[model samples]
Target: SMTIAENITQLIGGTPLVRLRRVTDGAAADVVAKLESFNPAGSIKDRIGVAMIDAAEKAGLIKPDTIILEPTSGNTGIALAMVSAARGYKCVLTMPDTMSIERRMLLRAYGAELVLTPMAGAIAKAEELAKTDDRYFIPQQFENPANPAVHAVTTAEEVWRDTDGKVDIFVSGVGTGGTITGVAQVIKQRRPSAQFVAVEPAASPVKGPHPIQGIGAGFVPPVLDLALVDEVITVGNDDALELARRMATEEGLLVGISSGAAVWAARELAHRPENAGKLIVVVLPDFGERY
Candidate 1:
């Protein structure tokens, strides 16, 4: 019985953490990467997708016939739809019209019905549906406690266990803020010296748009506690895309654009004189194949 699973949803977490060799010359410390792309659904959001739905089930908020509903640009929607399909719940995902065709196709692959909306319309329409319908269950990733809690239990646990609690600092791209918020809470508890850095898009002046998908909407998520982060770095779309390309060719890691941004921020920390030889862990949240 080698690696047999009862269902696809069983393979959500326990992703491998790899060390960066080629893309880290500027980094005086060893920059390690937690590859969230290894998830069965192709992103770390897979963890919260299952975790959120499991919480909903225990709270008696959803039944098999209840429709899972949410507004998202990419990863979370894919994670939701993928888990929904596995658990036999029909899904309706609302997205801004700006979301690409590839994600639309990915949603369809998971048997999710799609609704496209204009800029403000995505969340607006989803709220309207939630208000009008009794059968729709919204996982509300931005505000969900389960979102961050999953990382505290799984992601942070994995990192600490694998690294033998030797982690020095963390660098991650922020989306729902679940990953960073949750991971840091646990990591800092065990090793109080473990610092954290957040990466957002260059265009985000508290609210704006940028090309790094799966992270950095620029909006401060409810789940993300700003006080937990030590610092924030802004990365441009052009720089993110270029590093993404280089990671594939040089580092032998084919990941999404936001991971590139995470590495960019890690390099910023590495170049500092005080950070020399420290262990830096960067969260690379998704697979670029979806882009």
Candidate 2:
């Protein structure tokens, strides 16, 4: 067994890259899943959580006493809360009130402050609140280059190196669009022919409110460099749920809704005629336990 590090910060990133067995059993092609849930915080957002705060500190945007403010669907908030607690910073989150009660309780468990916006109002409503509240500093992940920078510098680098540039299709869920944007940059630099696909909820219409918390956008994120993406696929909430359930019951891999959406897209991409005999990579952002 590996020895525990003195601090949890040492455990950020370095998640497992798991190849799907049951989900893609006997498929015409190969499908691999990056199990980001393996992170110490149980989510890929742990990287972003550390990056945004560290980036702000390095850039003089925040001090030890400064309160960190931002909007999250769920995972990021938990990441921020945990990191801030360990680092002696006050963290506040602006989130949709409709999120699972477990998320709220977890945030509080980490001693982070919770500020709920209108349940049906989406992130735009939370952003509106951040604008007027002079006391808070919004580390808006959507616009923060650090958001994608973490992915570009760390996650994407891992994928490229680990896969040895054999990756053909890179599929991920798009919320603030950071993961797709950042990973696309690295994949294109290494494998220009590699396709980048963004998975969003079917209910969002590529431009609306999606019940799926982690993906889709009512407003475009600045960190999302659109040129990096090759295509976007819409997934239904029920489909996401079904896959998430299967992840547990069949695959024995516990993952969240967004991870399920990614699996759905990756399967579709793998079965496509053009992708025959190619390698497909899917990103699983967090564990089902977080939801």
Candidate 3:
């Protein structure tokens, strides 16, 4: 019998892993992707959103009237908005005006208040609001341990279970750095020899804006543990976009730009002589419709 979830939050994790056949056809290593777009909020951030909120509740930090404020490039805000609506908390998201119209509309549809800021000023704006408003609680997704903790418990465990402990390399584009850091820690414990690769925009260390949302945030997030990351690869925006297009047409995997970047990095790693015959798992953070 098929089990029914009580609510959307119950569907936050347990996304599927898909192997790449055509994209990595000539590569020596087997490449697979964790399709996080299956989450209720259409992104991996849904895991963190539920984690953070539940943590706050356990710690007695939030009340029914408490407002949840967050700074997001895109997915995190949507995730938070969805959670807030379900939990009956007021959500205010501060984001750069440059984000996709779809994200803005989704937040509104979820009853979240929007605060537009300069492309690089969203974080600062969110912080300022949190400081000034006593009723507001900032989950601070970039620095929050809960962000990585959820990925460790849920995302990593799913990857380990689904791959049956055979994964050799883990790859993900860095946003809050939670996904890679958290997922790497758990996978490394089970498969101690596993290598972790972090992907970023070629324009990084980002001096200016780039097309890929949810990644290349210009600096290493506080939650990121560099020691766990074995390598860092840079993907150009154009190359990322091209691969995303190919994924949709060839593999029917319509992932977001950052997912494209991670896949590109996974392919690069697969070509390396040392990594040959290894199994690489790349995390696809969200779906392409938002891009």
Candidate 4:
């Protein structure tokens, strides 16, 4: 069945969920990974990239001359940059140099201007630029309702209908928290007994520095509504990367480290009797090519 879309933006959501056959080796439940790398921009952030711009457009916040700016570790900025290129807008992304070079190169490939600085310094630089110039329009994904709302409607919808509303546990990394907070709200409402788990880099008590690039951005962004989280699972970046390699060799899911984090959380829940026969879904955020 061949399908056609109007453009790349039209291909943002509706990713497929493939059962994790090899990685769930001895777990009591089945684990399904939502391969968000299938997205055109190669990350789950594509959902919010389109939604936020549409939100700004509806509110009359963007004009022809508007320069879209946002602080991101990689994927979200890449998403926005790709969208900006397609829609004919100038995009300026601020990110720390700590992120992989693949991310920086991809952002440039989308014709976006990049501002890379020391780790933990890019966010403030973006904030300063947006306020100093009226020409800059920051999507402010950290607090943007559209970020989570997009996940609620698109990501959540696909997960529910695809899983036949039988999701026993939901696992995701809290980046903008747009995905976890948004998808959990809908999944929980439909299946009251389901659990929501959040993934993070190990030893991130202060949330300052970690290898999980997208999540744990030093502070708990207001967009994250954690009331739904049943547990928080932390994994070392080294261990997460090892799992990521295993995922590729074993199950053929060539996803980023964040996905590994989600799988780490879901695997722990799979052996619990309370989650017996549970169909756990982990949101695998991006492609491994970034690393």
Candidate 3: where are CA atoms >4 Å away?
141-148, 204-224
lDDT of 1 by residue, 146-197 (tens): 3446644688888888889898888887765667777777778789989987
lDDT of 2 by residue, 72-152 (tens): 777888888888888888887878888788879988998988878663354565567667755556664433554456644
Q: Candidate 2, TM-score vs. the true structure?
A: 0.82
- In candidate 4, which residue pairs get closer than 3 Å at backbone N, Cα or C atoms, i.e. clash? none
Query: Per-prediction TM-score, please?
Result: 0.88, 0.82, 0.86, 0.86
Tens-digit per-residue lDDT, 1-291, candidate 3: 989987778878889989998877589999999998999889888888888888888788898899999888878889999999988899999898988787788899999999997734887788788889899998844335434466556778887889888999989877656677777777777788899888886642222322233433446532345556777787887878878888999999998888888888899899989989999999898789734
User: Looking at candidate 3, what is the lDDT of residue 237?
Assistant: 78
lDDT to native, each model: 0.81, 0.77, 0.81, 0.79
Pairs of colliding residues, candidate 1:
none
Clashes of each: 0, 0, 0, 0
Between 1 and 3, whose TM-score is larger? 1
Query: Which residue window of length 10 is worst by lDDT in model 3?
Result: 204-213
**Any residue pairs clashing in model 3, and if so which?**
none
